PDB file of C-alpha atoms and ligand atoms in Angstrom:
ATOM      1  CA  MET A1308      -5.087  -5.227 -38.049  1.00 56.90           C
ATOM      2  CA  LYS A1309      -7.288  -2.469 -36.020  1.00 58.97           C
ATOM      3  CA  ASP A1310      -9.408  -2.611 -33.150  1.00 61.51           C
ATOM      4  CA  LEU A1311     -13.057  -3.262 -33.300  1.00 63.57           C
ATOM      5  CA  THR A1312     -15.890  -1.679 -31.872  1.00 64.12           C
ATOM      6  CA  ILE A1313     -19.705  -2.524 -31.893  1.00 61.89           C
ATOM      7  CA  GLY A1314     -22.369  -0.429 -30.705  1.00 60.97           C
ATOM      8  CA  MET A1315     -25.819  -1.772 -30.204  1.00 57.84           C
ATOM      9  CA  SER A1316     -28.499   0.038 -29.181  1.00 59.93           C
ATOM     10  CA  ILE A1317     -31.465  -1.883 -28.450  1.00 59.63           C
ATOM     11  CA  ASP A1318     -35.313  -0.900 -28.082  1.00 60.47           C
ATOM     12  CA  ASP A1319     -35.987  -2.583 -24.415  1.00 60.45           C
ATOM     13  CA  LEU A1320     -35.719  -5.699 -22.758  1.00 60.46           C
ATOM     14  CA  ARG A1321     -39.434  -6.439 -22.110  1.00 61.67           C
ATOM     15  CA  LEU A1322     -39.574  -9.059 -24.189  1.00 63.42           C
ATOM     16  CA  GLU A1323     -37.895 -12.581 -22.970  1.00 65.06           C
ATOM     17  CA  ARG A1324     -36.369 -12.931 -26.256  1.00 62.38           C
ATOM     18  CA  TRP A1325     -33.935  -9.423 -25.943  1.00 64.38           C
ATOM     19  CA  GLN A1326     -31.990 -10.564 -23.276  1.00 64.32           C
ATOM     20  CA  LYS A1327     -30.760 -13.283 -25.402  1.00 62.25           C
ATOM     21  CA  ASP A1328     -29.933 -11.570 -27.901  1.00 58.93           C
ATOM     22  CA  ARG A1329     -27.768  -9.128 -26.181  1.00 61.38           C
ATOM     23  CA  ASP A1330     -26.062 -11.919 -24.277  1.00 61.24           C
ATOM     24  CA  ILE A1331     -26.011 -14.158 -26.991  1.00 59.43           C
ATOM     25  CA  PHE A1332     -24.415 -11.241 -29.420  1.00 58.06           C
ATOM     26  CA  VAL A1333     -21.863  -9.776 -26.960  1.00 55.56           C
ATOM     27  CA  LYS A1334     -20.724 -13.244 -26.217  1.00 53.20           C
ATOM     28  CA  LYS A1335     -19.888 -14.229 -29.662  1.00 49.32           C
ATOM     29  CA  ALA A1336     -18.978 -10.741 -30.701  1.00 47.43           C
ATOM     30  CA  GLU A1337     -16.146 -10.780 -28.117  1.00 49.59           C
ATOM     31  CA  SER A1338     -14.918 -13.884 -28.484  1.00 50.35           C
ATOM     32  CA  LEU A1339     -13.983 -12.426 -32.527  1.00 52.21           C
ATOM     33  CA  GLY A1340     -11.882  -9.497 -30.546  1.00 50.34           C
ATOM     34  CA  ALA A1341     -14.448  -6.597 -30.464  1.00 49.57           C
ATOM     35  CA  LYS A1342     -14.949  -4.795 -27.856  1.00 50.73           C
ATOM     36  CA  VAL A1343     -19.345  -4.011 -27.462  1.00 50.14           C
ATOM     37  CA  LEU A1344     -21.117  -0.872 -26.088  1.00 47.86           C
ATOM     38  CA  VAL A1345     -24.846  -1.796 -25.571  1.00 48.41           C
ATOM     39  CA  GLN A1346     -27.480   0.889 -24.391  1.00 48.03           C
ATOM     40  CA  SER A1347     -31.597  -0.001 -24.451  1.00 49.47           C
ATOM     41  CA  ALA A1348     -33.728   3.019 -24.993  1.00 53.96           C
ATOM     42  CA  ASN A1349     -36.525   1.211 -23.056  1.00 55.52           C
ATOM     43  CA  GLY A1350     -39.163   1.931 -25.965  1.00 54.11           C
ATOM     44  CA  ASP A1351     -38.032   6.236 -25.929  1.00 58.03           C
ATOM     45  CA  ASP A1352     -37.250   7.197 -29.153  1.00 59.32           C
ATOM     46  CA  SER A1353     -35.687  10.085 -28.565  1.00 59.19           C
ATOM     47  CA  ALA A1354     -33.524   8.362 -26.023  1.00 58.34           C
ATOM     48  CA  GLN A1355     -32.722   5.682 -29.129  1.00 57.70           C
ATOM     49  CA  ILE A1356     -31.683   8.574 -30.839  1.00 56.78           C
ATOM     50  CA  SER A1357     -29.433   9.629 -28.016  1.00 51.94           C
ATOM     51  CA  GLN A1358     -27.471   6.858 -27.496  1.00 54.63           C
ATOM     52  CA  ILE A1359     -27.260   6.223 -30.801  1.00 55.73           C
ATOM     53  CA  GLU A1360     -25.027   9.342 -31.501  1.00 61.66           C
ATOM     54  CA  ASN A1361     -23.234   8.843 -27.650  1.00 62.89           C
ATOM     55  CA  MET A1362     -21.565   5.618 -29.791  1.00 62.12           C
ATOM     56  CA  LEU A1363     -21.017   7.732 -32.184  1.00 65.11           C
ATOM     57  CA  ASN A1364     -18.952   9.837 -30.097  1.00 65.00           C
ATOM     58  CA  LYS A1365     -17.139   6.837 -28.933  1.00 61.47           C
ATOM     59  CA  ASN A1366     -15.991   6.120 -32.497  1.00 62.41           C
ATOM     60  CA  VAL A1367     -17.374   2.868 -33.022  1.00 60.79           C
ATOM     61  CA  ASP A1368     -16.889   1.418 -36.192  1.00 61.27           C
ATOM     62  CA  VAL A1369     -20.304  -0.498 -36.705  1.00 62.87           C
ATOM     63  CA  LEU A1370     -23.365   0.348 -35.461  1.00 61.16           C
ATOM     64  CA  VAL A1371     -25.946  -3.028 -34.493  1.00 62.75           C
ATOM     65  CA  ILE A1372     -28.965  -0.980 -34.242  1.00 62.38           C
ATOM     66  CA  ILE A1373     -32.801  -2.564 -33.285  1.00 59.72           C
ATOM     67  CA  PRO A1374     -35.422   0.154 -33.691  1.00 60.14           C
ATOM     68  CA  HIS A1375     -38.038   1.061 -31.464  1.00 58.57           C
ATOM     69  CA  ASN A1376     -39.733   2.911 -34.771  1.00 61.27           C
ATOM     70  CA  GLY A1377     -38.394   2.247 -37.955  1.00 58.19           C
ATOM     71  CA  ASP A1378     -38.957   5.802 -39.142  1.00 56.97           C
ATOM     72  CA  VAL A1379     -37.250   8.143 -36.959  1.00 56.98           C
ATOM     73  CA  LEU A1380     -33.208   7.095 -37.382  1.00 56.69           C
ATOM     74  CA  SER A1381     -32.911   7.840 -40.668  1.00 60.59           C
ATOM     75  CA  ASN A1382     -30.708  11.000 -39.836  1.00 61.57           C
ATOM     76  CA  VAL A1383     -28.885   9.758 -36.853  1.00 58.66           C
ATOM     77  CA  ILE A1384     -27.634   6.762 -39.188  1.00 57.19           C
ATOM     78  CA  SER A1385     -26.773   9.362 -42.367  1.00 56.84           C
ATOM     79  CA  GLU A1386     -24.356  11.033 -39.301  1.00 58.44           C
ATOM     80  CA  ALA A1387     -22.757   7.692 -39.068  1.00 59.68           C
ATOM     81  CA  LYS A1388     -22.064   7.198 -42.738  1.00 58.44           C
ATOM     82  CA  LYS A1389     -21.036   9.998 -42.891  1.00 54.01           C
ATOM     83  CA  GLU A1390     -18.110   9.253 -39.769  1.00 52.43           C
ATOM     84  CA  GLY A1391     -17.326   5.920 -41.834  1.00 48.05           C
ATOM     85  CA  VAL A1392     -19.381   3.683 -39.675  1.00 49.36           C
ATOM     86  CA  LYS A1393     -20.955   0.741 -40.657  1.00 48.03           C
ATOM     87  CA  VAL A1394     -24.484   0.435 -39.724  1.00 50.75           C
ATOM     88  CA  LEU A1395     -26.475  -3.145 -39.215  1.00 47.68           C
ATOM     89  CA  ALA A1396     -29.937  -3.253 -39.016  1.00 49.52           C
ATOM     90  CA  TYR A1397     -31.212  -6.380 -36.213  1.00 51.85           C
ATOM     91  CA  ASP A1398     -33.915  -8.756 -36.758  1.00 53.93           C
ATOM     92  CA  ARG A1399     -36.136  -5.136 -37.459  1.00 53.95           C
ATOM     93  CA  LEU A1400     -35.781  -3.089 -40.788  1.00 52.89           C
ATOM     94  CA  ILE A1401     -35.243   0.637 -40.383  1.00 55.94           C
ATOM     95  CA  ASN A1402     -36.784   2.414 -43.279  1.00 57.48           C
ATOM     96  CA  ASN A1403     -35.540   5.420 -45.649  1.00 57.57           C
ATOM     97  CA  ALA A1404     -32.143   4.530 -43.972  1.00 55.05           C
ATOM     98  CA  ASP A1405     -28.474   4.140 -45.597  1.00 54.16           C
ATOM     99  CA  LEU A1406     -28.300   0.813 -44.075  1.00 50.18           C
ATOM    100  CA  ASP A1407     -25.216  -1.835 -44.875  1.00 50.48           C
ATOM    101  CA  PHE A1408     -26.732  -4.888 -44.145  1.00 49.01           C
ATOM    102  CA  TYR A1409     -30.215  -6.361 -42.095  1.00 50.63           C
ATOM    103  CA  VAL A1410     -30.115 -10.032 -40.380  1.00 51.84           C
ATOM    104  CA  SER A1411     -33.677 -11.510 -39.635  1.00 52.22           C
ATOM    105  CA  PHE A1412     -35.326 -14.505 -39.762  1.00 52.67           C
ATOM    106  CA  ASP A1413     -38.218 -14.048 -42.801  1.00 52.79           C
ATOM    107  CA  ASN A1414     -40.683 -12.402 -41.248  1.00 50.63           C
ATOM    108  CA  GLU A1415     -43.080 -12.502 -44.059  1.00 50.36           C
ATOM    109  CA  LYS A1416     -42.911 -16.626 -43.506  1.00 54.68           C
ATOM    110  CA  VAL A1417     -43.647 -16.322 -39.805  1.00 56.14           C
ATOM    111  CA  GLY A1418     -46.788 -14.766 -40.484  1.00 57.33           C
ATOM    112  CA  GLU A1419     -47.802 -17.389 -42.818  1.00 59.02           C
ATOM    113  CA  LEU A1420     -46.959 -19.742 -40.699  1.00 58.30           C
ATOM    114  CA  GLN A1421     -48.996 -18.376 -37.616  1.00 52.26           C
ATOM    115  CA  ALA A1422     -52.158 -18.414 -39.992  1.00 51.98           C
ATOM    116  CA  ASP A1423     -51.823 -21.645 -41.593  1.00 52.97           C
ATOM    117  CA  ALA A1424     -51.922 -23.500 -38.239  1.00 56.62           C
ATOM    118  CA  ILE A1425     -54.920 -21.244 -36.715  1.00 59.60           C
ATOM    119  CA  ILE A1426     -57.199 -21.723 -39.965  1.00 63.74           C
ATOM    120  CA  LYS A1427     -56.187 -25.750 -39.255  1.00 64.31           C
ATOM    121  CA  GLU A1428     -57.589 -25.408 -36.000  1.00 63.39           C
ATOM    122  CA  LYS A1429     -60.487 -23.216 -36.882  1.00 64.86           C
ATOM    123  CA  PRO A1430     -61.567 -23.548 -40.633  1.00 66.88           C
ATOM    124  CA  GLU A1431     -64.556 -21.487 -40.322  1.00 66.97           C
ATOM    125  CA  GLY A1432     -65.785 -18.609 -38.193  1.00 65.98           C
ATOM    126  CA  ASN A1433     -65.360 -15.158 -36.528  1.00 63.91           C
ATOM    127  CA  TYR A1434     -61.561 -14.020 -36.712  1.00 61.92           C
ATOM    128  CA  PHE A1435     -59.862 -11.480 -35.067  1.00 61.89           C
ATOM    129  CA  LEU A1436     -56.538 -10.071 -36.094  1.00 59.38           C
ATOM    130  CA  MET A1437     -53.879  -8.705 -33.334  1.00 60.09           C
ATOM    131  CA  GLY A1438     -51.266  -7.205 -35.638  1.00 63.06           C
ATOM    132  CA  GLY A1439     -47.777  -6.321 -33.753  1.00 64.52           C
ATOM    133  CA  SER A1440     -46.799  -2.616 -32.546  1.00 65.15           C
ATOM    134  CA  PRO A1441     -47.374  -0.242 -35.553  1.00 62.82           C
ATOM    135  CA  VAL A1442     -44.033   1.383 -35.496  1.00 62.34           C
ATOM    136  CA  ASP A1443     -42.312  -1.941 -35.985  1.00 62.24           C
ATOM    137  CA  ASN A1444     -41.940  -2.919 -40.027  1.00 62.07           C
ATOM    138  CA  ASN A1445     -42.090  -6.774 -38.864  1.00 60.77           C
ATOM    139  CA  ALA A1446     -45.168  -6.078 -37.540  1.00 63.80           C
ATOM    140  CA  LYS A1447     -46.522  -5.257 -41.330  1.00 64.06           C
ATOM    141  CA  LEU A1448     -44.663  -8.401 -43.071  1.00 67.05           C
ATOM    142  CA  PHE A1449     -46.230 -10.911 -40.529  1.00 66.09           C
ATOM    143  CA  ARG A1450     -49.685  -9.398 -41.198  1.00 66.24           C
ATOM    144  CA  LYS A1451     -48.457  -9.838 -44.749  1.00 65.83           C
ATOM    145  CA  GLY A1452     -47.757 -13.402 -44.510  1.00 65.17           C
ATOM    146  CA  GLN A1453     -50.855 -13.671 -42.053  1.00 65.00           C
ATOM    147  CA  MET A1454     -52.840 -12.708 -45.298  1.00 63.20           C
ATOM    148  CA  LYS A1455     -52.293 -14.624 -47.793  1.00 64.57           C
ATOM    149  CA  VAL A1456     -53.478 -17.351 -46.287  1.00 67.41           C
ATOM    150  CA  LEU A1457     -56.346 -15.929 -44.231  1.00 67.51           C
ATOM    151  CA  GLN A1458     -57.523 -14.088 -47.468  1.00 67.07           C
ATOM    152  CA  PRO A1459     -58.885 -16.936 -49.702  1.00 64.31           C
ATOM    153  CA  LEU A1460     -61.262 -18.203 -46.840  1.00 64.29           C
ATOM    154  CA  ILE A1461     -62.494 -14.402 -46.023  1.00 62.18           C
ATOM    155  CA  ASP A1462     -63.448 -14.157 -50.390  1.00 61.57           C
ATOM    156  CA  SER A1463     -65.012 -17.744 -49.934  1.00 62.30           C
ATOM    157  CA  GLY A1464     -66.937 -16.586 -46.941  1.00 66.49           C
ATOM    158  CA  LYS A1465     -66.072 -19.284 -44.969  1.00 66.18           C
ATOM    159  CA  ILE A1466     -63.770 -16.551 -41.939  1.00 69.12           C
ATOM    160  CA  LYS A1467     -65.134 -13.305 -41.036  1.00 69.12           C
ATOM    161  CA  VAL A1468     -62.767 -10.477 -39.752  1.00 71.55           C
ATOM    162  CA  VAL A1469     -64.471  -9.311 -36.886  1.00 71.75           C
ATOM    163  CA  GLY A1470     -61.544  -7.118 -35.247  1.00 73.49           C
ATOM    164  CA  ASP A1471     -58.159  -5.612 -36.243  1.00 68.35           C
ATOM    165  CA  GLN A1472     -56.236  -3.600 -33.797  1.00 67.06           C
ATOM    166  CA  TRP A1473     -52.427  -3.124 -34.114  1.00 67.96           C
ATOM    167  CA  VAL A1474     -50.849  -3.371 -29.846  1.00 72.28           C
ATOM    168  CA  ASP A1475     -48.341  -0.565 -29.236  1.00 71.52           C
ATOM    169  CA  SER A1476     -45.178  -1.517 -28.816  1.00 72.05           C
ATOM    170  CA  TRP A1477     -46.207  -5.122 -28.307  1.00 73.07           C
ATOM    171  CA  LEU A1478     -47.023  -4.726 -24.649  1.00 73.97           C
ATOM    172  CA  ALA A1479     -48.801  -7.149 -23.089  1.00 74.33           C
ATOM    173  CA  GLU A1480     -51.145  -5.173 -21.220  1.00 73.42           C
ATOM    174  CA  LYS A1481     -52.347  -3.285 -24.446  1.00 72.39           C
ATOM    175  CA  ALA A1482     -53.253  -6.823 -25.810  1.00 74.59           C
ATOM    176  CA  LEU A1483     -55.118  -7.286 -22.693  1.00 78.01           C
ATOM    177  CA  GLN A1484     -56.998  -4.283 -22.754  1.00 76.25           C
ATOM    178  CA  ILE A1485     -57.867  -5.015 -27.131  1.00 74.17           C
ATOM    179  CA  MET A1486     -58.728  -8.542 -25.932  1.00 76.59           C
ATOM    180  CA  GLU A1487     -61.195  -7.331 -23.564  1.00 80.40           C
ATOM    181  CA  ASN A1488     -62.648  -4.750 -25.149  1.00 81.13           C
ATOM    182  CA  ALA A1489     -63.001  -6.900 -28.054  1.00 82.32           C
ATOM    183  CA  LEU A1490     -64.784  -9.818 -27.060  1.00 81.23           C
ATOM    184  CA  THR A1491     -67.541  -7.473 -25.075  1.00 82.29           C
ATOM    185  CA  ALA A1492     -68.077  -5.565 -28.438  1.00 87.17           C
ATOM    186  CA  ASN A1493     -68.776  -9.162 -30.312  1.00 88.82           C
ATOM    187  CA  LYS A1494     -70.523 -10.878 -27.043  1.00 88.74           C
ATOM    188  CA  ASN A1495     -67.745 -13.264 -26.850  1.00 88.15           C
ATOM    189  CA  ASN A1496     -68.067 -14.627 -30.418  1.00 88.69           C
ATOM    190  CA  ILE A1497     -64.825 -14.658 -31.558  1.00 90.02           C
ATOM    191  CA  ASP A1498     -63.494 -18.412 -32.531  1.00 91.13           C
ATOM    192  CA  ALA A1499     -59.883 -17.675 -33.221  1.00 93.65           C
ATOM    193  CA  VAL A1500     -57.366 -14.703 -32.780  1.00 91.11           C
ATOM    194  CA  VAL A1501     -54.358 -14.108 -35.216  1.00 93.87           C
ATOM    195  CA  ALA A1502     -52.011 -12.714 -32.499  1.00 94.81           C
ATOM    196  CA  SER A1503     -48.300 -11.727 -33.844  1.00 95.23           C
ATOM    197  CA  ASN A1504     -46.306 -12.668 -30.993  1.00 91.38           C
ATOM    198  CA  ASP A1505     -45.785 -14.694 -27.133  1.00 90.14           C
ATOM    199  CA  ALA A1506     -46.070 -11.749 -24.760  1.00 87.35           C
ATOM    200  CA  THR A1507     -49.524 -10.327 -26.962  1.00 88.37           C
ATOM    201  CA  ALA A1508     -51.168 -13.728 -27.190  1.00 87.85           C
ATOM    202  CA  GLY A1509     -50.688 -13.959 -22.954  1.00 86.46           C
ATOM    203  CA  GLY A1510     -52.222 -11.034 -22.938  1.00 85.22           C
ATOM    204  CA  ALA A1511     -55.385 -11.739 -24.802  1.00 89.73           C
ATOM    205  CA  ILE A1512     -55.574 -15.084 -23.158  1.00 91.99           C
ATOM    206  CA  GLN A1513     -56.186 -13.691 -20.161  1.00 96.06           C
ATOM    207  CA  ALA A1514     -58.829 -11.652 -21.497  1.00 99.62           C
ATOM    208  CA  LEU A1515     -60.136 -15.245 -22.766  1.00 98.49           C
ATOM    209  CA  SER A1516     -59.640 -16.832 -19.522  1.00103.11           C
ATOM    210  CA  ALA A1517     -61.378 -13.932 -17.764  1.00104.57           C
ATOM    211  CA  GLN A1518     -64.677 -15.008 -19.859  1.00102.36           C
ATOM    212  CA  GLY A1519     -64.004 -18.781 -19.785  1.00100.87           C
ATOM    213  CA  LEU A1520     -62.818 -19.109 -23.421  1.00101.23           C
ATOM    214  CA  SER A1521     -59.244 -19.892 -22.785  1.00103.83           C
ATOM    215  CA  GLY A1522     -58.896 -23.047 -24.317  1.00101.88           C
ATOM    216  CA  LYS A1523     -61.610 -22.415 -26.550  1.00101.45           C
ATOM    217  CA  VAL A1524     -60.259 -20.243 -29.104  1.00 99.13           C
ATOM    218  CA  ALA A1525     -57.516 -20.277 -31.350  1.00 99.28           C
ATOM    219  CA  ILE A1526     -54.600 -17.851 -31.118  1.00 98.29           C
ATOM    220  CA  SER A1527     -51.103 -18.009 -32.371  1.00 97.30           C
ATOM    221  CA  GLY A1528     -47.731 -16.479 -31.467  1.00 95.14           C
ATOM    222  CA  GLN A1529     -44.040 -16.414 -31.604  1.00 93.91           C
ATOM    223  CA  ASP A1530     -40.474 -16.412 -29.719  1.00 95.68           C
ATOM    224  CA  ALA A1531     -41.343 -19.237 -27.944  1.00 95.05           C
ATOM    225  CA  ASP A1532     -41.662 -17.612 -24.381  1.00 94.40           C
ATOM    226  CA  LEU A1533     -41.237 -20.306 -22.116  1.00 94.83           C
ATOM    227  CA  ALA A1534     -44.916 -19.100 -20.583  1.00 95.53           C
ATOM    228  CA  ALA A1535     -45.943 -19.994 -24.606  1.00 92.86           C
ATOM    229  CA  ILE A1536     -44.229 -23.110 -24.100  1.00 90.37           C
ATOM    230  CA  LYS A1537     -46.106 -23.707 -21.002  1.00 92.85           C
ATOM    231  CA  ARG A1538     -49.410 -22.607 -22.313  1.00 97.48           C
ATOM    232  CA  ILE A1539     -49.020 -24.824 -25.246  1.00 97.76           C
ATOM    233  CA  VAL A1540     -48.855 -27.554 -23.381  1.00 98.60           C
ATOM    234  CA  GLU A1541     -52.019 -26.582 -21.029  1.00 98.14           C
ATOM    235  CA  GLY A1542     -53.972 -26.661 -24.315  1.00 95.50           C
ATOM    236  CA  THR A1543     -54.320 -22.320 -24.116  1.00 93.50           C
ATOM    237  CA  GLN A1544     -52.302 -21.722 -27.161  1.00 92.05           C
ATOM    238  CA  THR A1545     -52.379 -23.165 -30.127  1.00 93.59           C
ATOM    239  CA  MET A1546     -49.044 -22.316 -31.435  1.00 92.49           C
ATOM    240  CA  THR A1547     -45.952 -20.215 -31.429  1.00 91.96           C
ATOM    241  CA  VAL A1548     -43.040 -20.256 -33.548  1.00 88.52           C
ATOM    242  CA  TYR A1549     -39.400 -21.017 -32.935  1.00 94.70           C
ATOM    243  CA  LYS A1550     -36.885 -18.107 -33.592  1.00 97.18           C
ATOM    244  CA  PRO A1551     -33.380 -20.273 -32.545  1.00 95.34           C
ATOM    245  CA  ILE A1552     -31.553 -16.417 -31.230  1.00 91.73           C
ATOM    246  CA  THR A1553     -28.408 -18.190 -31.125  1.00 89.84           C
ATOM    247  CA  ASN A1554     -28.466 -18.712 -35.338  1.00 92.90           C
ATOM    248  CA  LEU A1555     -29.250 -14.924 -35.541  1.00 93.60           C
ATOM    249  CA  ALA A1556     -27.424 -13.112 -33.006  1.00 95.30           C
ATOM    250  CA  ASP A1557     -24.374 -15.585 -34.195  1.00 96.85           C
ATOM    251  CA  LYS A1558     -24.304 -14.223 -37.468  1.00 98.14           C
ATOM    252  CA  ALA A1559     -25.337 -10.904 -36.746  1.00 98.82           C
ATOM    253  CA  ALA A1560     -22.126 -11.329 -34.528  1.00 97.74           C
ATOM    254  CA  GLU A1561     -20.001 -12.635 -37.631  1.00 97.20           C
ATOM    255  CA  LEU A1562     -21.472 -10.013 -39.844  1.00 94.94           C
ATOM    256  CA  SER A1563     -20.865  -7.348 -37.540  1.00 97.51           C
ATOM    257  CA  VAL A1564     -16.740  -8.215 -37.811  1.00 98.38           C
ATOM    258  CA  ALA A1565     -17.214  -8.079 -41.506  1.00 99.54           C
ATOM    259  CA  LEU A1566     -18.581  -4.537 -42.095  1.00 98.65           C
ATOM    260  CA  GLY A1567     -15.726  -3.907 -39.786  1.00 96.35           C
ATOM    261  CA  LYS A1568     -12.760  -5.648 -42.095  1.00 97.24           C
ATOM    262  CA  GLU A1569     -14.826  -4.445 -44.928  1.00 98.59           C
ATOM    263  CA  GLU A1570     -15.457  -7.715 -46.182  1.00 98.95           C
ATOM    264  CA  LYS A1571     -17.426  -8.884 -49.234  1.00101.06           C
ATOM    265  CA  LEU A1572     -20.715 -10.365 -47.679  1.00101.74           C
ATOM    266  CA  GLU A1573     -22.951 -13.288 -48.538  1.00101.37           C
ATOM    267  CA  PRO A1574     -26.522 -11.743 -48.837  1.00101.11           C
ATOM    268  CA  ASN A1575     -29.359 -14.270 -49.153  1.00102.13           C
ATOM    269  CA  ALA A1576     -32.444 -11.576 -49.949  1.00106.75           C
ATOM    270  CA  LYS A1577     -32.566  -8.238 -50.404  1.00104.15           C
ATOM    271  CA  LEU A1578     -35.589  -5.647 -49.183  1.00103.53           C
ATOM    272  CA  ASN A1579     -36.320  -2.387 -50.461  1.00103.24           C
ATOM    273  CA  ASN A1580     -36.682   0.396 -47.601  1.00103.64           C
ATOM    274  CA  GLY A1581     -37.960   3.440 -49.579  1.00102.66           C
ATOM    275  CA  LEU A1582     -34.286   4.781 -50.066  1.00104.71           C
ATOM    276  CA  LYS A1583     -32.082   1.687 -51.370  1.00106.08           C
ATOM    277  CA  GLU A1584     -32.067  -2.164 -51.551  1.00102.77           C
ATOM    278  CA  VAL A1585     -30.757  -3.602 -48.259  1.00 99.72           C
ATOM    279  CA  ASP A1586     -28.954  -6.363 -48.620  1.00 96.93           C
ATOM    280  CA  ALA A1587     -30.072  -8.763 -46.040  1.00100.03           C
ATOM    281  CA  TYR A1588     -29.217 -12.477 -44.590  1.00100.59           C
ATOM    282  CA  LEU A1589     -33.447 -13.922 -43.394  1.00 98.64           C
ATOM    283  CA  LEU A1590     -33.019 -17.301 -41.005  1.00 96.47           C
ATOM    284  CA  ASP A1591     -35.862 -19.432 -41.590  1.00 94.45           C
ATOM    285  CA  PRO A1592     -38.343 -19.979 -38.416  1.00 93.20           C
ATOM    286  CA  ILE A1593     -40.130 -22.674 -36.484  1.00 92.88           C
ATOM    287  CA  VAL A1594     -43.533 -24.046 -36.024  1.00 93.51           C
ATOM    288  CA  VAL A1595     -43.685 -25.145 -32.477  1.00 93.33           C
ATOM    289  CA  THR A1596     -46.916 -27.197 -31.952  1.00 98.09           C
ATOM    290  CA  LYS A1597     -48.132 -29.094 -28.484  1.00 95.90           C
ATOM    291  CA  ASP A1598     -46.586 -32.565 -30.404  1.00 93.11           C
ATOM    292  CA  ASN A1599     -42.777 -31.198 -31.226  1.00 94.89           C
ATOM    293  CA  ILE A1600     -41.949 -29.074 -28.348  1.00 99.46           C
ATOM    294  CA  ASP A1601     -39.933 -31.738 -27.451  1.00102.47           C
ATOM    295  CA  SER A1602     -38.383 -32.616 -31.276  1.00103.27           C
ATOM    296  CA  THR A1603     -37.781 -28.896 -30.989  1.00104.58           C
ATOM    297  CA  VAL A1604     -37.744 -26.171 -28.148  1.00104.75           C
ATOM    298  CA  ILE A1605     -35.987 -28.907 -25.421  1.00105.34           C
ATOM    299  CA  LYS A1606     -34.096 -30.376 -28.557  1.00106.81           C
ATOM    300  CA  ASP A1607     -31.684 -27.249 -28.668  1.00107.62           C
ATOM    301  CA  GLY A1608     -31.471 -26.358 -25.264  1.00108.30           C
ATOM    302  CA  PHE A1609     -33.529 -22.851 -25.713  1.00109.71           C
ATOM    303  CA  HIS A1610     -35.749 -24.660 -22.517  1.00115.21           C
ATOM    304  CA  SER A1611     -35.057 -27.164 -20.440  1.00114.66           C
ATOM    305  CA  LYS A1612     -37.784 -29.920 -20.004  1.00115.27           C
ATOM    306  CA  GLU A1613     -37.099 -29.257 -16.044  1.00114.53           C
ATOM    307  CA  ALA A1614     -38.278 -25.724 -16.988  1.00114.79           C
ATOM    308  CA  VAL A1615     -41.178 -26.388 -19.333  1.00115.54           C
ATOM    309  CA  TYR A1616     -43.005 -29.403 -17.524  1.00116.38           C
ATOM    310  CA  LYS A1617     -41.696 -29.453 -13.545  1.00118.97           C
TER     311      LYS A1617
HETATM  312  O1  XYP B1078     -41.164  -7.720 -31.132  1.00117.71           O
HETATM  313  C1  XYP B1078     -41.225  -8.961 -32.215  1.00117.71           C
HETATM  314  C2  XYP B1078     -40.696 -10.036 -31.486  1.00117.71           C
HETATM  315  O2  XYP B1078     -41.704 -10.474 -30.624  1.00117.71           O
HETATM  316  C3  XYP B1078     -40.309 -10.765 -32.380  1.00117.71           C
HETATM  317  O3  XYP B1078     -39.529 -11.897 -32.106  1.00117.71           O
HETATM  318  O4  XYP B1078     -39.486 -10.431 -33.776  1.00117.71           O
HETATM  319  C4  XYP B1078     -39.573  -9.262 -34.461  1.00117.71           C
HETATM  320  C5  XYP B1078     -39.747  -8.301 -33.476  1.00117.71           C
HETATM  321  O5  XYP B1078     -40.348  -7.632 -34.434  1.00117.71           O
END
């Protein structure tokens, strides 16, 4: 049986979740006898490219990529394919690429859950939509799900959208700036903020808190960062979407190994990336509110009750 090396290329380690993605996946893939190389581009596209090429040069059998920019990797991926390398897209889809497979959560469903919980908290009023990174395919999918829910209420005029901004590279500080400016331009007449992840909600909430609005404006999130959990506890963030990282990382590990033995995979979705429909496996997300923090995140050991409350 051939030895297997997996090349893992990741965006950055700024969002709390990616550390756990990387560590959990390495541990698992190593349990299955693979050697994992891992490299972080720290948000630089050209750097990502170079790192993927470094790994191709080290003759990895499988590439596991978390793209910074899902539109800039087409070429380097086709060069991998010429060399017989299997390519698995991790969490964020890569567009116009010769991908073998894609593993992620139902990201459209995530969006919808976010909006569902916010129009529950604030059924009428002024709404600000805070998109994710404009070069992450997931940011568009979150929005797409958000809208499915939000649209019927826009069209009945029960809701009014008073801003719509995407936050470059998911940075919390760019989210703060955007929210700071939004509040100003609206004279603080915003009722709800559909923010697409925890790091950016948190950005926005510091802006809200500067105006005495934290706790009074409904805001969404995802990843269940420890900080976001405590905010939900304190009444500052309405909700977050929990995405069990262990289950995703474990499945990607299993899939990496299967692609290396050329096994027939079992997809449960197919996603058109512009070049082709990519076989995909999507996990189900979980809504976390103040009531079920104990049913979900502490129950799974994602965060300990000591971390959350003490
Ligand atoms: O950056 C996003 C991250 O916060 C979310 O958890 O997973 C999808 C990514 O696009």
